[PDB]
Amino acid sequence: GSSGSSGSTRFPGVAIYLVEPRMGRSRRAFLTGLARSKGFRVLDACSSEATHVVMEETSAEEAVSWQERRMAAAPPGCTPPALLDISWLTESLGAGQPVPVECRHRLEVAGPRKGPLSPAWMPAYACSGPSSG
């Protein structure tokens, strides 16, 4: 409380890493330092240690695209880091501790859709049929 020393992050097992083309060179620092103060280890360069990746304004699928690059320059057996959004981080910082990842956080896709967007629905006066009695 009074002193100001540091050696081993509170949660070393969890290493959060941000993206340049996703966070920026200036902004990155903002969180980079903020987290460190809370109790999170920020990695400068993409390293196997990286367990969680922080992406801002990234689509569930988009994240994956950037994840591929890892497996490309990553060693065998090494498990890929869980791609999450800024929401997760923010919630963590405000909590002082790394919250447990959740579906919403996980950034993944599957069986995507295609085509334009339109209602193509029917109005109220779009019902008919015979009757008796």
Side-chain angles (χ1 to χ4, degrees), residues 8-101:
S8 207
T9 189
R10 291 206 183 174
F11 327 113
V14 46
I16 301 157
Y17 169 94
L18 324 153
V19 212
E20 267 199 302
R22 212 65 51 187
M23 197 150 281
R25 64 208 206 78
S26 279
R27 178 155 72 193
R28 160 154 89 65
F30 190 110
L31 303 165
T32 299
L34 185 70
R36 277 158 88 276
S37 302
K38 294 277 180 197
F40 313 97
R41 178 201 204 74
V42 177
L43 306 160
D44 179 67
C46 290
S47 307
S48 279
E49 272 69 83
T51 53
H52 312 95
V53 187
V54 177
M55 281 181 214
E56 208 280 310
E57 275 203 276
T58 301
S59 186
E61 57 183 324
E62 271 307 273
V64 177
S65 202
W66 179 101
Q67 167 186 72
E68 274 273 330
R69 299 288 192 164
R70 305 276 298 92
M71 274 298 104
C78 181
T79 301
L83 316 168
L84 322 187
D85 270 353
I86 180 65
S87 177
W88 177 80
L89 188 61
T90 54
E91 277 189 74
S92 305
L93 301 154
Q97 72 167 358
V99 292
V101 179

Side-chain angles (χ1 to χ4, degrees), residues 1-6 10:
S2 64
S3 297
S5 202
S6 199
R10 291 206 183 174

